Amino acid sequence: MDVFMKGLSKAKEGVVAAAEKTKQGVAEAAGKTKEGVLYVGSKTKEGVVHGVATVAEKTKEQVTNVGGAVVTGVTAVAQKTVEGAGSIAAATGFVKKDQ
Amino acid sequence: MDVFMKGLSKAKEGVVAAAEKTKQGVAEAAGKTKEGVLYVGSKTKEGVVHGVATVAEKTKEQVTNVGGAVVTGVTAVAQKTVEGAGSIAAATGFVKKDQ
Amino acid sequence: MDVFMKGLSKAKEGVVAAAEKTKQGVAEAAGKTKEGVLYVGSKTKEGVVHGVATVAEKTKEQVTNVGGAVVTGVTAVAQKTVEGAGSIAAATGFVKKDQ
Amino acid sequence: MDVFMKGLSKAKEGVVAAAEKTKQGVAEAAGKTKEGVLYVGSKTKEGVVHGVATVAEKTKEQVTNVGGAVVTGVTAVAQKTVEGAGSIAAATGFVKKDQ
Amino acid sequence: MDVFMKGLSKAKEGVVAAAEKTKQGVAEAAGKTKEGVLYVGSKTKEGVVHGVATVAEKTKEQVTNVGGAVVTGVTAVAQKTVEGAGSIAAATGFVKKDQ
Amino acid sequence: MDVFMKGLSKAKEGVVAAAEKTKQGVAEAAGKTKEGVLYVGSKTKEGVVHGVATVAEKTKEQVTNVGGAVVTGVTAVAQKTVEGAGSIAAATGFVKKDQ
Amino acid sequence: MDVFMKGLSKAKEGVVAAAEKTKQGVAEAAGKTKEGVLYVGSKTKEGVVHGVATVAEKTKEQVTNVGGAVVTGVTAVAQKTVEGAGSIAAATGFVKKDQ
Amino acid sequence: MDVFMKGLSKAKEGVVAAAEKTKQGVAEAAGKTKEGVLYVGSKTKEGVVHGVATVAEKTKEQVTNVGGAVVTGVTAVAQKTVEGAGSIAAATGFVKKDQ
Amino acid sequence: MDVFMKGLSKAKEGVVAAAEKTKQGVAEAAGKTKEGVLYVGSKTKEGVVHGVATVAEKTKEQVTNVGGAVVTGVTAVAQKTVEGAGSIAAATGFVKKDQ
Amino acid sequence: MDVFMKGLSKAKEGVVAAAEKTKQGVAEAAGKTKEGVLYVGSKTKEGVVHGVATVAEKTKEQVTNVGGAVVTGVTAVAQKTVEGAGSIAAATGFVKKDQ
Amino acid sequence: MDVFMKGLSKAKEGVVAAAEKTKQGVAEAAGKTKEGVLYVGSKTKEGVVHGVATVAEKTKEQVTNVGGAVVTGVTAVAQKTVEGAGSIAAATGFVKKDQ
Amino acid sequence: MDVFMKGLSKAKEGVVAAAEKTKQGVAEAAGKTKEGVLYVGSKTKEGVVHGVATVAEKTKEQVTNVGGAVVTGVTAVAQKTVEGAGSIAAATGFVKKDQ
Amino acid sequence: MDVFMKGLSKAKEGVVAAAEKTKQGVAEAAGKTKEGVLYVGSKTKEGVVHGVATVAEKTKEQVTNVGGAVVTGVTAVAQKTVEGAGSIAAATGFVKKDQ
Amino acid sequence: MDVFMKGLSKAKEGVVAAAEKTKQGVAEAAGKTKEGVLYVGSKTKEGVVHGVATVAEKTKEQVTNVGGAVVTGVTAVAQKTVEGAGSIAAATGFVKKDQ
């Protein structure tokens, strides 16, 4: 009863190798990001509103604007990022050369 | 009953190698970020509002603006970041050469 | 019953190697950041408002602006960051050469 | 029942090596940052407001502006950071050469 | 029942090595920072306001501005930081050469 | 039941080595900083205001500005910090050469 | 039940070595700083205001400005800090050479 | 939109009369009793247990006894309560005699 | 929108009369009692337990006894309460005799 | 929007009359009693326990006895309470005799 | 928006009359009693325990006895309370005789 | 928006009359009593214990007895209280006789 | 917005009359009593204990007895209180006889 | 916004009359008593203990007995209090006879 990602559970010998997120001449934007997160036997409440109550004995109008989580206005621009000749962006996980 | 990521649980021999987030000539922006986080047997409340109450015996209007979590205005710009010739951005996880 | 990330639990021999976040000619911005955080058997309350109450016997209008967590105005700009020839940005995790 | 990150729990021999956050010609900004933090059997309250009460027997308007945590105005700029030829930014975790 | 980061719990032999935060020609700014912090069996209250009360028998308007934690105005600028030729910024964790 | 960071708990032999925060030609600014802090079985109150009370039998307006913790105005600038040729900034954790 | 950082608890032989905060041609500023602090079985109150009371039988306006902890105006500037050729800033933790 | 019991809502003339719970030579017992109760726009939690958690890495048995509300042992006895001759127990709601 | 019990809402003339709980030679017992109670726009928590946690790395048994509200042992006895001749217990709500 | 019990809301003329709890030769007992109680816009916590935590690294048994509200041992006895002849217990709400 | 019990809200003429709790030859006992109580816009905590924590690295047993509110041992006895002939216990609310 | 008990809010003419708690030959006992109490905009904590902590590195047993509010031992006895002939206990609220 | 008990708020003419607690041949006992109490905009702490801490590195047993409020031992006895013939205990609220 | 008990707020004419606590042949006892008390905008701490701390490096047992408020031993006895014939105990609130 094992839960895992990117690995080995029961092996006499093992190798885990990785190369991630190599960037050259890049423009990036993000509102909310979650990377490498584990939840085990826990509660979680994010961007939550419980109760809304609007009561009036006499009035003209009543309105309500309620929101849990909101993301607006994400922009990314890139112009002429790479111009040099012979630019190289390489990523390798595992190189094995034995004699 | 093991929970894990990027590793080995039961192995006589093992190797864990990684190279991450190599950046050259980059522009990045973020509102909220979470990396390498573990929750075990815990509570969590982030960006939460519990109760909203609006009561009036006599009035003209009533409005409410309620929000848990809000992110606005994220921008990234890059211009002519790389111009030199022969620029190299390399990432490797594990190099094994034995004799 | 072990919870872990980037490691080995039960192994006769083991090696853990990593190289992370190598930056050259970069511009970065962030509102909130969390890296390498562990929660075990704990409470947590961040950006929280419990109760909202608005009561009036006689009035004209009533409005409310309530927010738990807010992030605004994140910007990053990069211009001509790299111009020298033969610039190198390298990251390696583990190099093994034995005789 | 062990909780850990970047390490070994039960191993006859082990090695933990890391090289992190190597920066050259960089501009960085942040509002709030948390790195290498452990919570065990503890409470935590950050940016919290408990109760809001607005009561009037007679009035014209009533408004409220309430916020738990707020971050505004984060900016980073970089210009011509690197111009020298043959600039090198290298990061290595573990180098093993034995005879 | 051990909780740890960047280390070994039960091993006959072990080595822990690290090189962190090597900076050259960098400009950095931060509002609030937390590094290498442990909480065990403790309370914590940071940027908190408990109660808000606004009562009037007769008035015209009533407003309230309440905030727990606020960060504003973080800026970083870098210009022509590196110009010398053959600049090197290197970081290594562990070098092992034995005869 | 041991809680620790950057160390070994139960090992016949062990070595802990580190080199941190090597800076050359850098400009840094911070509002609040916490490094290497331990809390065990303790209370903590920082930037806290308990109660707010505003009562008037007759008035025109009433407003309140309340804040727990505030940080404003953090700036860092760097210009032509490094110009000499062959500048080196090196950091190493552990060098082992035995005969 | 041991709580520690940067050390060994139960080991026949051990070595703890560190080199930290080596600076050359740097400009730094900070509002509040805490380094190497331990709290055990203690209370702590910093930047706290308990009660706010504003009462008037008859008036025109009433306002209040209350703050627990405030930091403003932190600036750092560096210009042409390093110009000599062959400048070296090195940091090492442990060098072991035995015969 | 009227909700009521034992009464009149819209009537030019009305009469409400009642005689309740007339007891003679009686024995009564009760565990929990609720009489004449109104709930309007409210929450209510009585005899509630939220969460049950039983976790063991190694053990022999584990059992749990959980209960929300429990009533036990209610008894009533009456013997020869009434022996006098001509005992009367009368109840009347409304007697109207007009001339 | 009126909520009521034992009364009149909109009537030119009205009468409310009642006679309740007339007791003679009685024995009564009760554990918990609620009479004439109104809840409007309120919370309520009575006899509540929130969380139960039982964790063991190694043990033999573990048991738990949890209860919200408990009532035990209610008894009432009556013997020869009434023996006099011509005992009267009368209850009337409203007697109207007009000339 | 009126909430009431035993009364009149909108009536030109009205009468409210009551006679309650007339007792003769009675024995009564109670654990907890609530009579004539109003809750409006309020919180309430009675007989509550929040958290239960039982943790052991090594042990033999562990048990817990937790209770919110408990009532035990209520008894009432009556013997030969009334023996006189011609005993009267009368209750009337309203007697109206006009000429 | 009126909340009331045993009364009149809007009436040209009104009368409120009551006679309560007339006792003769009675024995009464009570643990806790609440009569004529009003809660408006208030908090309330009665018989409450917040947190329970039991932690042991090595032990044999651990038990806990926790209780919020407890009532035990309520008894009432009456014997031959009334023996005189022609005893009267009368209660009247309102007597109106006009000429 | 009026909250009241046993009274009139808006009436040209009104009368409030009451006769309460007339006792003859009675025996009464009580642990805790509350009569005629008003709470408005206030806090209240009665019989409360906040935190329980039991920690041991090595021990044999550990137990805890915690209680918020406790009432024990309430008794009332009455014997031959009334023996005289023609005893009268009368209670009246309002007697109106006009000419 | 008026809160009151046993009275009139807005009436051209009014009368408030009461007769309470008339006792003859009575025995009474009480542990704690509260009569005619008003709380407005105030705090209140009665019978409260905040923190409990029990820590031992090595021991055999540890126990704790903690209590907020405790009442024990309340008794009342009455014997042959009334024996004279023609004893009268009368209570009246308001007698109105006009010519 | 008036808070009151046993009175009139806004009335052209008014009368407040009361007769309370008339006792004949009575025995009474009480531990703590509060009558006619008003709290407005004040703090209050009665029978409170803040912190409990028990720490031992090596010991055999440790126990603690802590109590906030305690009442014990309240007794009342009455015997043959009234024996004279024609004893009268009368209480009246208001007698109005006009010509």
PDB file of N, CA, C and O in Angstrom, chain C residues 49-94:
ATOM      1  N   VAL C  49     -10.858  36.557   7.903  1.00  0.00           N
ATOM      2  CA  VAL C  49     -11.737  37.451   8.648  1.00  0.00           C
ATOM      3  C   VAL C  49     -12.982  36.656   9.019  1.00  0.00           C
ATOM      4  O   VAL C  49     -13.583  36.005   8.159  1.00  0.00           O
ATOM      5  N   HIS C  50     -13.362  36.692  10.297  1.00  0.00           N
ATOM      6  CA  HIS C  50     -14.380  35.759  10.776  1.00  0.00           C
ATOM      7  C   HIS C  50     -15.793  36.257  10.487  1.00  0.00           C
ATOM      8  O   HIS C  50     -16.529  35.638   9.711  1.00  0.00           O
ATOM      9  N   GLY C  51     -16.190  37.373  11.092  1.00  0.00           N
ATOM     10  CA  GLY C  51     -17.584  37.775  11.071  1.00  0.00           C
ATOM     11  C   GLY C  51     -17.770  39.167  10.520  1.00  0.00           C
ATOM     12  O   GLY C  51     -16.961  40.067  10.769  1.00  0.00           O
ATOM     13  N   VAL C  52     -18.856  39.346   9.772  1.00  0.00           N
ATOM     14  CA  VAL C  52     -19.258  40.639   9.228  1.00  0.00           C
ATOM     15  C   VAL C  52     -20.694  40.897   9.660  1.00  0.00           C
ATOM     16  O   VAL C  52     -21.577  40.063   9.422  1.00  0.00           O
ATOM     17  N   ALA C  53     -20.931  42.051  10.282  1.00  0.00           N
ATOM     18  CA  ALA C  53     -22.246  42.412  10.797  1.00  0.00           C
ATOM     19  C   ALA C  53     -22.541  43.862  10.447  1.00  0.00           C
ATOM     20  O   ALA C  53     -21.763  44.757  10.793  1.00  0.00           O
ATOM     21  N   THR C  54     -23.665  44.090   9.770  1.00  0.00           N
ATOM     22  CA  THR C  54     -24.124  45.430   9.420  1.00  0.00           C
ATOM     23  C   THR C  54     -25.606  45.530   9.747  1.00  0.00           C
ATOM     24  O   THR C  54     -26.433  44.896   9.085  1.00  0.00           O
ATOM     25  N   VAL C  55     -25.938  46.326  10.761  1.00  0.00           N
ATOM     26  CA  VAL C  55     -27.308  46.477  11.237  1.00  0.00           C
ATOM     27  C   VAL C  55     -27.620  47.960  11.367  1.00  0.00           C
ATOM     28  O   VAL C  55     -26.807  48.727  11.893  1.00  0.00           O
ATOM     29  N   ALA C  56     -28.794  48.362  10.882  1.00  0.00           N
ATOM     30  CA  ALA C  56     -29.245  49.745  10.961  1.00  0.00           C
ATOM     31  C   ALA C  56     -30.756  49.777  11.119  1.00  0.00           C
ATOM     32  O   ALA C  56     -31.475  49.094  10.384  1.00  0.00           O
ATOM     33  N   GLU C  57     -31.235  50.571  12.079  1.00  0.00           N
ATOM     34  CA  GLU C  57     -32.675  50.739  12.244  1.00  0.00           C
ATOM     35  C   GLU C  57     -33.249  51.625  11.145  1.00  0.00           C
ATOM     36  O   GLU C  57     -34.324  51.341  10.606  1.00  0.00           O
ATOM     37  N   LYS C  58     -32.551  52.706  10.805  1.00  0.00           N
ATOM     38  CA  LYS C  58     -32.937  53.558   9.688  1.00  0.00           C
ATOM     39  C   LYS C  58     -31.683  54.133   9.052  1.00  0.00           C
ATOM     40  O   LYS C  58     -30.788  54.608   9.757  1.00  0.00           O
ATOM     41  N   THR C  59     -31.621  54.084   7.724  1.00  0.00           N
ATOM     42  CA  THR C  59     -30.461  54.565   6.989  1.00  0.00           C
ATOM     43  C   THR C  59     -30.849  54.757   5.532  1.00  0.00           C
ATOM     44  O   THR C  59     -31.995  54.521   5.146  1.00  0.00           O
ATOM     45  N   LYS C  60     -29.880  55.205   4.730  1.00  0.00           N
ATOM     46  CA  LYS C  60     -30.111  55.303   3.293  1.00  0.00           C
ATOM     47  C   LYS C  60     -29.460  54.142   2.552  1.00  0.00           C
ATOM     48  O   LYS C  60     -30.156  53.355   1.900  1.00  0.00           O
ATOM     49  N   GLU C  61     -28.137  53.998   2.652  1.00  0.00           N
ATOM     50  CA  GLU C  61     -27.474  52.865   2.022  1.00  0.00           C
ATOM     51  C   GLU C  61     -26.566  52.225   3.060  1.00  0.00           C
ATOM     52  O   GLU C  61     -26.261  52.823   4.096  1.00  0.00           O
ATOM     53  N   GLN C  62     -26.130  51.003   2.768  1.00  0.00           N
ATOM     54  CA  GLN C  62     -25.045  50.371   3.505  1.00  0.00           C
ATOM     55  C   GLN C  62     -24.300  49.426   2.577  1.00  0.00           C
ATOM     56  O   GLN C  62     -24.915  48.610   1.884  1.00  0.00           O
ATOM     57  N   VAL C  63     -22.974  49.545   2.568  1.00  0.00           N
ATOM     58  CA  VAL C  63     -22.116  48.729   1.721  1.00  0.00           C
ATOM     59  C   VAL C  63     -20.968  48.202   2.569  1.00  0.00           C
ATOM     60  O   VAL C  63     -20.666  48.738   3.639  1.00  0.00           O
ATOM     61  N   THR C  64     -20.335  47.131   2.095  1.00  0.00           N
ATOM     62  CA  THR C  64     -19.213  46.519   2.794  1.00  0.00           C
ATOM     63  C   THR C  64     -18.215  45.978   1.783  1.00  0.00           C
ATOM     64  O   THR C  64     -18.605  45.356   0.789  1.00  0.00           O
ATOM     65  N   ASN C  65     -16.931  46.219   2.039  1.00  0.00           N
ATOM     66  CA  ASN C  65     -15.837  45.693   1.230  1.00  0.00           C
ATOM     67  C   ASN C  65     -14.933  44.877   2.149  1.00  0.00           C
ATOM     68  O   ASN C  65     -14.236  45.440   2.999  1.00  0.00           O
ATOM     69  N   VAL C  66     -14.943  43.558   1.973  1.00  0.00           N
ATOM     70  CA  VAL C  66     -14.220  42.636   2.841  1.00  0.00           C
ATOM     71  C   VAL C  66     -13.359  41.726   1.978  1.00  0.00           C
ATOM     72  O   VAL C  66     -13.835  41.182   0.974  1.00  0.00           O
ATOM     73  N   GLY C  67     -12.096  41.556   2.370  1.00  0.00           N
ATOM     74  CA  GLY C  67     -11.188  40.689   1.647  1.00  0.00           C
ATOM     75  C   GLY C  67     -10.211  39.952   2.542  1.00  0.00           C
ATOM     76  O   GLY C  67      -9.649  40.538   3.471  1.00  0.00           O
ATOM     77  N   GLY C  68      -9.999  38.664   2.273  1.00  0.00           N
ATOM     78  CA  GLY C  68      -9.082  37.889   3.095  1.00  0.00           C
ATOM     79  C   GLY C  68      -7.628  38.140   2.744  1.00  0.00           C
ATOM     80  O   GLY C  68      -6.856  38.647   3.562  1.00  0.00           O
ATOM     81  N   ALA C  69      -7.231  37.781   1.524  1.00  0.00           N
ATOM     82  CA  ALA C  69      -5.867  37.976   1.052  1.00  0.00           C
ATOM     83  C   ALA C  69      -5.907  38.586  -0.338  1.00  0.00           C
ATOM     84  O   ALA C  69      -6.688  38.146  -1.187  1.00  0.00           O
ATOM     85  N   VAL C  70      -5.066  39.592  -0.570  1.00  0.00           N
ATOM     86  CA  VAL C  70      -5.061  40.343  -1.818  1.00  0.00           C
ATOM     87  C   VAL C  70      -3.620  40.568  -2.253  1.00  0.00           C
ATOM     88  O   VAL C  70      -2.771  40.937  -1.435  1.00  0.00           O
ATOM     89  N   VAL C  71      -3.350  40.345  -3.536  1.00  0.00           N
ATOM     90  CA  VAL C  71      -2.059  40.638  -4.147  1.00  0.00           C
ATOM     91  C   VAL C  71      -2.309  41.427  -5.423  1.00  0.00           C
ATOM     92  O   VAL C  71      -3.104  41.007  -6.271  1.00  0.00           O
ATOM     93  N   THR C  72      -1.633  42.566  -5.557  1.00  0.00           N
ATOM     94  CA  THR C  72      -1.787  43.421  -6.725  1.00  0.00           C
ATOM     95  C   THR C  72      -0.437  44.003  -7.114  1.00  0.00           C
ATOM     96  O   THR C  72       0.436  44.224  -6.272  1.00  0.00           O
ATOM     97  N   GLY C  73      -0.274  44.246  -8.410  1.00  0.00           N
ATOM     98  CA  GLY C  73       0.880  44.987  -8.893  1.00  0.00           C
ATOM     99  C   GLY C  73       2.196  44.246  -8.815  1.00  0.00           C
ATOM    100  O   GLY C  73       3.063  44.611  -8.012  1.00  0.00           O
ATOM    101  N   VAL C  74       2.366  43.210  -9.629  1.00  0.00           N
ATOM    102  CA  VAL C  74       3.640  42.510  -9.744  1.00  0.00           C
ATOM    103  C   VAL C  74       4.126  42.621 -11.183  1.00  0.00           C
ATOM    104  O   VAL C  74       3.422  42.223 -12.118  1.00  0.00           O
ATOM    105  N   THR C  75       5.331  43.158 -11.361  1.00  0.00           N
ATOM    106  CA  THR C  75       5.869  43.430 -12.686  1.00  0.00           C
ATOM    107  C   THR C  75       7.349  43.088 -12.727  1.00  0.00           C
ATOM    108  O   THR C  75       8.070  43.289 -11.745  1.00  0.00           O
ATOM    109  N   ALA C  76       7.796  42.574 -13.871  1.00  0.00           N
ATOM    110  CA  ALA C  76       9.197  42.256 -14.105  1.00  0.00           C
ATOM    111  C   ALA C  76       9.563  42.612 -15.538  1.00  0.00           C
ATOM    112  O   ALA C  76       8.802  42.333 -16.467  1.00  0.00           O
ATOM    113  N   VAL C  77      10.731  43.228 -15.710  1.00  0.00           N
ATOM    114  CA  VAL C  77      11.207  43.678 -17.014  1.00  0.00           C
ATOM    115  C   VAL C  77      12.682  43.328 -17.142  1.00  0.00           C
ATOM    116  O   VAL C  77      13.445  43.473 -16.182  1.00  0.00           O
ATOM    117  N   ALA C  78      13.079  42.868 -18.327  1.00  0.00           N
ATOM    118  CA  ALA C  78      14.468  42.557 -18.634  1.00  0.00           C
ATOM    119  C   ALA C  78      14.787  43.051 -20.036  1.00  0.00           C
ATOM    120  O   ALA C  78      13.997  42.842 -20.963  1.00  0.00           O
ATOM    121  N   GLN C  79      15.942  43.696 -20.193  1.00  0.00           N
ATOM    122  CA  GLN C  79      16.352  44.270 -21.468  1.00  0.00           C
ATOM    123  C   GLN C  79      17.844  44.054 -21.675  1.00  0.00           C
ATOM    124  O   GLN C  79      18.656  44.496 -20.858  1.00  0.00           O
ATOM    125  N   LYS C  80      18.196  43.381 -22.771  1.00  0.00           N
ATOM    126  CA  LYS C  80      19.592  43.211 -23.175  1.00  0.00           C
ATOM    127  C   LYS C  80      20.435  42.653 -22.032  1.00  0.00           C
ATOM    128  O   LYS C  80      21.572  43.069 -21.809  1.00  0.00           O
ATOM    129  N   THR C  81      19.873  41.682 -21.310  1.00  0.00           N
ATOM    130  CA  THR C  81      20.538  41.172 -20.115  1.00  0.00           C
ATOM    131  C   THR C  81      21.873  40.521 -20.452  1.00  0.00           C
ATOM    132  O   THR C  81      22.864  40.718 -19.741  1.00  0.00           O
ATOM    133  N   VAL C  82      21.920  39.741 -21.529  1.00  0.00           N
ATOM    134  CA  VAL C  82      23.113  38.995 -21.915  1.00  0.00           C
ATOM    135  C   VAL C  82      23.551  39.470 -23.292  1.00  0.00           C
ATOM    136  O   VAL C  82      22.769  39.420 -24.250  1.00  0.00           O
ATOM    137  N   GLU C  83      24.799  39.929 -23.391  1.00  0.00           N
ATOM    138  CA  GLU C  83      25.386  40.338 -24.655  1.00  0.00           C
ATOM    139  C   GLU C  83      26.780  39.775 -24.884  1.00  0.00           C
ATOM    140  O   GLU C  83      27.207  39.688 -26.041  1.00  0.00           O
ATOM    141  N   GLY C  84      27.496  39.397 -23.831  1.00  0.00           N
ATOM    142  CA  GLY C  84      28.826  38.846 -24.009  1.00  0.00           C
ATOM    143  C   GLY C  84      28.782  37.503 -24.716  1.00  0.00           C
ATOM    144  O   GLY C  84      27.865  36.702 -24.525  1.00  0.00           O
ATOM    145  N   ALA C  85      29.792  37.259 -25.545  1.00  0.00           N
ATOM    146  CA  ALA C  85      29.864  36.011 -26.288  1.00  0.00           C
ATOM    147  C   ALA C  85      30.396  34.890 -25.403  1.00  0.00           C
ATOM    148  O   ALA C  85      31.213  35.118 -24.505  1.00  0.00           O
ATOM    149  N   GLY C  86      29.929  33.675 -25.665  1.00  0.00           N
ATOM    150  CA  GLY C  86      30.394  32.519 -24.918  1.00  0.00           C
ATOM    151  C   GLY C  86      29.982  32.515 -23.462  1.00  0.00           C
ATOM    152  O   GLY C  86      30.762  32.090 -22.600  1.00  0.00           O
ATOM    153  N   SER C  87      28.775  32.987 -23.164  1.00  0.00           N
ATOM    154  CA  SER C  87      28.249  32.880 -21.812  1.00  0.00           C
ATOM    155  C   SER C  87      27.688  31.482 -21.581  1.00  0.00           C
ATOM    156  O   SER C  87      27.009  30.918 -22.443  1.00  0.00           O
ATOM    157  N   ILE C  88      27.976  30.923 -20.409  1.00  0.00           N
ATOM    158  CA  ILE C  88      27.595  29.558 -20.072  1.00  0.00           C
ATOM    159  C   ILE C  88      26.884  29.564 -18.729  1.00  0.00           C
ATOM    160  O   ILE C  88      27.362  30.181 -17.771  1.00  0.00           O
ATOM    161  N   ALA C  89      25.747  28.878 -18.663  1.00  0.00           N
ATOM    162  CA  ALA C  89      25.030  28.636 -17.418  1.00  0.00           C
ATOM    163  C   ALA C  89      24.753  27.144 -17.326  1.00  0.00           C
ATOM    164  O   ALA C  89      23.875  26.628 -18.026  1.00  0.00           O
ATOM    165  N   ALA C  90      25.496  26.456 -16.463  1.00  0.00           N
ATOM    166  CA  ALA C  90      25.446  25.006 -16.373  1.00  0.00           C
ATOM    167  C   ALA C  90      25.049  24.583 -14.969  1.00  0.00           C
ATOM    168  O   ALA C  90      25.415  25.231 -13.985  1.00  0.00           O
ATOM    169  N   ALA C  91      24.295  23.491 -14.889  1.00  0.00           N
ATOM    170  CA  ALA C  91      23.879  22.902 -13.626  1.00  0.00           C
ATOM    171  C   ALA C  91      23.981  21.391 -13.739  1.00  0.00           C
ATOM    172  O   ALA C  91      23.472  20.801 -14.698  1.00  0.00           O
ATOM    173  N   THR C  92      24.639  20.768 -12.765  1.00  0.00           N
ATOM    174  CA  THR C  92      24.834  19.325 -12.745  1.00  0.00           C
ATOM    175  C   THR C  92      24.501  18.805 -11.356  1.00  0.00           C
ATOM    176  O   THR C  92      24.712  19.505 -10.361  1.00  0.00           O
ATOM    177  N   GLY C  93      23.971  17.584 -11.295  1.00  0.00           N
ATOM    178  CA  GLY C  93      23.573  17.027 -10.012  1.00  0.00           C
ATOM    179  C   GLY C  93      24.659  16.176  -9.382  1.00  0.00           C
ATOM    180  O   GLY C  93      24.998  16.347  -8.208  1.00  0.00           O
ATOM    181  N   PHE C  94      25.217  15.243 -10.150  1.00  0.00           N
ATOM    182  CA  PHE C  94      26.182  14.290  -9.627  1.00  0.00           C
ATOM    183  C   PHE C  94      27.084  13.826 -10.760  1.00  0.00           C
ATOM    184  O   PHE C  94      26.603  13.367 -11.798  1.00  0.00           O
TER     185      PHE C  94
END
